[PDB]
From a paper:
Here, we report two cryo-EM structures of the [name]-bound [name]-pore, long and short, at 2.64- and 2.56-Å resolution, respectively. We describe the interaction between [name] and [name] based on the highest-resolution structure to date of the [name]-bound [name]-pore (short). By contrast, the short structure showed no density at the tip of the β-barrel stem (residues 332–363) because of its flexibility. The most striking difference between the structures was that D4II (receptor-binding domain II) was observed in the long, but not in the short complex. Binding induces the unfolding and tilting of the first N-terminal α-helix of [name], in addition to conformational changes to one of the constriction sites in the [name]-pore, called the NSS-loop, which grips [name]. Our 2.56-Å resolution analysis provided more precise insights, revealing ‘in’ and ‘out’ loop conformations (blue and yellow, respectively). In the A, B, and G subunits, which had almost no interaction with the [name] via the NSS-loop, the loop had two clear conformations. In the D and E subunits, the NSS-loop showed two conformations. However, in the C and F subunits, the NSS-loop was only observed in the ‘out’ conformation because of steric hindrance from [name]. (3) Two NSS-loop conformations would adapt to fit transient translocational [name] states: the unfolded and folded complexes showed different ‘in’ and ‘out’ conformations in the subunit D NSS-loop. The short [name]-bound [name]-pore map represents the total map, showing the small differences between folded and unfolded [name].
Author numbering:
A (entry chain H): 19 to 413
B (entry chain E): 492 to 539
C (entry chain C): 299 to 331, 364 to 539
D (entry chain B): 299 to 331, 364 to 742
The structure:
Amino acid sequence: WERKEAERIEQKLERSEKEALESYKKDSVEISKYSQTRNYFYDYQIEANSREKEYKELRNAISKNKIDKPMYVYYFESPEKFAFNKVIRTENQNEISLEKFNEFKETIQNKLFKQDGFKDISLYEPGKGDEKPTPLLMHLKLPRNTGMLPYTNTNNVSTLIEQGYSIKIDKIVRIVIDGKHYIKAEASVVSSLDFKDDVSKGDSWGKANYNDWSNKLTPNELADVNDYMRGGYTAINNYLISNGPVNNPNPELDSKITNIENALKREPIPTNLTVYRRSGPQEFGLTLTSPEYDFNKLENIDAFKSKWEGQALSYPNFISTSIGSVNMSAFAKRKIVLRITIPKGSPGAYLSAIPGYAGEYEVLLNHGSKFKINKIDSYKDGTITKLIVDATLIP
Amino acid sequence: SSGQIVTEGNSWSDYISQIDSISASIILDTENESYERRVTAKNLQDPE
Amino acid sequence: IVGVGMEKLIISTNEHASTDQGKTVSRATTNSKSTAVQDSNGESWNTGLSINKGESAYINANVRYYNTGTAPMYKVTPTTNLVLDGDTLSTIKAQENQIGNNLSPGDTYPKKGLSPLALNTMDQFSSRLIPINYDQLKKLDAGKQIKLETTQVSGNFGTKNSSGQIVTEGNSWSDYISQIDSISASIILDTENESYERRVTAKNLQDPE
Amino acid sequence: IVGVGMEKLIISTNEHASTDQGKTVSRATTNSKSTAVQDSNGESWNTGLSINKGESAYINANVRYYNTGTAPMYKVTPTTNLVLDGDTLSTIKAQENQIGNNLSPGDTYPKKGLSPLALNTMDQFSSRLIPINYDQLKKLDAGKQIKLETTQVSGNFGTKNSSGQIVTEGNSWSDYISQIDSISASIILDTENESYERRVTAKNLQDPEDKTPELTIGEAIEKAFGATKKDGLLYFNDIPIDESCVELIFDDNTANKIKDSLKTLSDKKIYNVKLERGMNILIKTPTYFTNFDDYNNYPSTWSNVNTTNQDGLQGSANKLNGETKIKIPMSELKPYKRYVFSGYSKDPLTSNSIIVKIKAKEEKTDYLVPEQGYTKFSYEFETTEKDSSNIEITLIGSGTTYLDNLSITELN
Ligand SMILES: [Ca+2]
């Protein structure tokens, strides 16, 4: 019956997705890698990539079919995807010690990890005749109305999905499969709003959510915020970095800070949202001339992840970020991109709501905001390897 | 999943015993038509 | 290790018997140039016996299966020979009526305490009986006995899934019989009330690998 | 390599026989204007016999399967012909009742010690017997025999699936039979109580892109039969299978190829000829053979025993001015078979021929003139009764001739 359902669902596909699926059956790894890191380029390459049409039609085919109930999936995942740089056990070893289990449990206590690519999954437990490439097994509960495309292989049937969410691990236990120890993790999907390339859709959402926000502001504070974001945001942030109220207190800027904070506090974000901000080395306590800014050698990336991944963050100033993820000529030289998930109910406002050029879809957050970094990944950008940071805003 | 209706492989015999085991049967006879129903009933000996 | 033993054989002679009986009444009148009136009545009896020399009788054999190995066989389907004097009358593969679902080591199908099963059809759909000749029927009536030989047995094994799901369909024992027999030695222990047959892997000293 | 051999045939005449028996009682009364009373009694008997000319009888054939190849066959399903005189009565593909699950190389189905299986149905579901006509039944009753010929065999091989399990369904040998036959030469070793048939890949010299390795006939034989080498000669298990110790039978094409290749060869040995596609080589080990060095098989003993000279094909000649006498007790030969006696001879200096005398059924005398080198003669005889007089072989001759590798081989 599963084969018949797969045949039925694949019959109604049109041709373009037909050769897309056929090409996926032989070049899975490269297509998956491209789909993982595709939205961090300029507007030119994304339209100019040789695989953009492939990805578009594959995504459409996947999104054609959706499930009406939550259901479970099973797949093997590398522990490196969950910010674990060590090895649980070798591929020839049979057992995992208590120390490695404890370390892996400690690494994933309270964190959320984002998955952003294609993946082959199974609707049944991995019994005999399957492959066990990693010592980590995932029991993932997919939410309602998510894409799921069953396609018949040469002999068996396999299913492909598109990851667009962030998952958290509840419990991990050690199990035995055919005389080898594995780690089984029960994970749940946490929903969030992400506009990877639909910058138009994100802008429309910002309009629909914050166009009337300005009408809720008292005119004096409204004009205050407008003029400040227009001209003096640089000065305010520069004053805030130096801990101005601590060193040289002055009310001419404390009033500005309070007004901006109250304006942001007036209307909070209603739904979980992801924002992309191109950060600089000066933010991370580095300089452009610093040797660690060269992310081409593996040693620099490894040291940066060792000393920064999994730690916290704190910005005394305000944070300006864009809903879209595509690179711009304004921040072309910045090698670090900050990926931030905004929990529902947190303070923040859409600056671009007001008419005119209010910014690059800018979003403001309250001062003294703190973040937790979960994982760090690197993607190629022309002739240099740039770096991506996943962070979660915390109250 | 496409909005279609399929009946092949969907047998009532797989559910007859399960429905009969956990239900009560009620029949209304009237004059021109008879009606038979099963309504789920709670097991008081099972706390779950 | 599955074998078949025959417990008794039953013969069904294929003969047609008829029986008739009639009554007749007559009456005649003659005029000459004298007169005469004649009254007659009679009766008759008849018997008959027809026989076909090609299919003169049908045979039915009662058999059991037994297992002296180490593993169970599922869906036991043996093939047997029926030999009268030096001629193989027929070879029959068991049909759906004569298939044993389970046969554990040391067990019997049908189980101990039940009657033997009847093997009395030869076609695939169990709609055709097993015939013999007129000469074979005469030999049987002369005291000669029919012997049953088992030539091969078909069966299945179970592969256990990680969640304890047994599957037997598509797991044929015949795919391993030759391979096991090629690399093993056979040892039989007879005792008195039960027999045990085993295969133990032996090393080939001509192969360095 | 699977064949089918019939062991006996059983005929079931399809006739209907009936018998009747009756009795009657009557009574009459007449009044003529006189009176009369008549009492009657009666009996009757009858016999009948009906025959259908279209289907007069049914036939049952007891058959066996055997394998002489290198690989097992699973689900053996042969197809056979039944020929009476020049007419094929029917061709039957084996049904479920006549399928052999396993057939290992050198084995037999049914296994040795069991009775043959009965092939007595022709339809797909084993529900219809095999009929013959009235004329065919008359021919059968006249003493004519039915022969069985196997035309093809269907079977499966085993592989490994995505797991470690062996799978045989869907793996047909017919997908590979033609391809194997197209690119290989066939070699058969007859031996005494077991036959072996092999296929060895041969290189095509017309194709520059055929990179398969080249082999001579001797190397091919050694690889195919797993023969070992003792002193440059091949031994199967203990029988010598060197070209000088056996009988080699070819077809016309193979004989022509070997003859053409020999003249251009240096050693001029058959085992040095290059192996080619389509060759058919049959090797037949002799029943009795002696090389006068280490191998002796004859029941009797040759009169002349003088093997102290380094002559012959391999270090022994056993020939002087004396004569050799041997007598076969006729209790060690097949009753009705066409044997052949063979050997090698040489006259290093020209002399008289050798009087070859054979007396098995009809006494024969023949003369052979040895050349400067070694040549073989191979005259024929035939046994009679398995209990008749002995067979005497004598080679009276003069002129200090020479001999080696005397052998007696059966032929069919
Ligand atoms: Ca010699």
